[PDB]
Amino acid sequence: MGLISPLATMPQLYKLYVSHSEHALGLSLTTWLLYSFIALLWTIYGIYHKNPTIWVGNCLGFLMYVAMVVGIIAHTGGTY
Amino acid sequence: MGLISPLATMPQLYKLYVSHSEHALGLSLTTWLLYSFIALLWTIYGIYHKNPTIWVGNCLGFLMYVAMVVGIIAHTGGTY
Secondary structure (H helix, E strand, C coil): CCCCCCHHHHHHHHHHHHHHHCCCCCHHHHHHHHHHHHHHHHHHHHCCCCCCCCCHHEEEEEHHHHHHHHHHHHHHHCCC | CCCCCCHHHHHHHHHHHHCCCCCCCCCHHHHHHHHHHHHHHHHHHHCCCHHHHHCHHHHHHHHHHHHHHHHHHHCCCCCC
């Protein structure tokens, strides 16, 4: 599912950026850092079994989520 | 961590709604449905062991994520 869910992100990327930029995600810088850890956190949990499933979706998720989050943050350079 | 990450959502809820509404999340209706399944999907996986850890964070995550997603969707009633 994690592999198929990035497919619905094809327009989310363009839509998000096209729809706006300063309020595209409406996320805070502090929250961004916490969110990033969560994505990687799941990967570490899976690594424990020396075979993380989430790692597959993590790559796409981390990149996709980060691209959107950084997009808004980079647009205003600030969030507060 | 999932229990502590909702804490950084205290201003995200107000910030997101206050920051905007039509472009608060910039998410699509179709994506919203897929996203909802992902949250619940993790819960089902954990249920398999008759002890889901994510279930704890799932409640807060699902409610928090849904509240923001529905907020933008309900604001415009459409996303495209």
